[PDB]
Design a protein around this ligand. Structure first.
Ligand SMILES: N#CCc1c[nH]c2ccccc12
Ligand SMILES: N#CCc1c[nH]c2ccccc12
Lengths: 105, 104
């Protein structure tokens, strides 16, 4: 096994719990309950962070905004730009290509 | 007190949030939601969402005690108070649906 039984048992529980949330939200979208579901489960600052992270990813893909514009307009300093860029690189290419189609056109 | 400056900022934040919500909606339609959520949420944030579902479930079920909520879910009294408030503030259609699906 990759992990010792204690760590593996914790990870399996967290994994099932994550998928339960993912499925709940999937069905909420189908029922047009997604907005109140997300308001329940995400704090206001967490919702704002998600909105801002979308802009950071958009601007990283677009390539036009400078480092200082990213910091002054979106709060993204050097470390945030580096982390977000790393997360983008780690994503499947299929997702990156879809994000380019949605977010940039 | 809301000013035109603060209102303009709040409306932009609102639109930015709705843009994320729409992006994720379409990702679910195209089976890209799992990698999208891994990109946009940090591991501890994803864990927090999974645990908050259990907190809401157990608050609705009404069986676990406060000590059991703290021990099993890490949810101490302040978290339970906040979560209970968020549940009570939810619209009736959501609370009714959560009762149906989480206590299935
Ligand atoms: N660091 C950090 C938070 C974070 C998660 N996903 C991101 C995507 C872009 C920028 C920042 C983030
Ligand atoms: N406090 C806090 C985080 C939080 C947001 N939504 C919740 C629902 C239930 C418990 C906790 C939370």
């Amino acid at each position: 096994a990759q992990q010792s039984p204690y760590s593996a048992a914790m990870a399996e529980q967290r994994h099932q719990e994550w998928l339960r949330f993912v499925d709940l939200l999937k069905n909420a979208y189908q029922n047009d309950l997604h907005l109140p579901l997300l308001n329940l489960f995400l704090l206001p600052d967490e919702r704002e962070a998600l909105g801002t992270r979308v802009r950071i990813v958009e601007e990283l893909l677009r390539g036009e905004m400078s480092q200082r514009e990213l910091k002054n307009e979106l709060g993204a300093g050097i470390a945030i730009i580096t982390r977000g860029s790393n997360y983008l690189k780690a994503a499947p290419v299929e997702l990156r290509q879809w994000l380019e189609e949605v977010l940039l056109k």
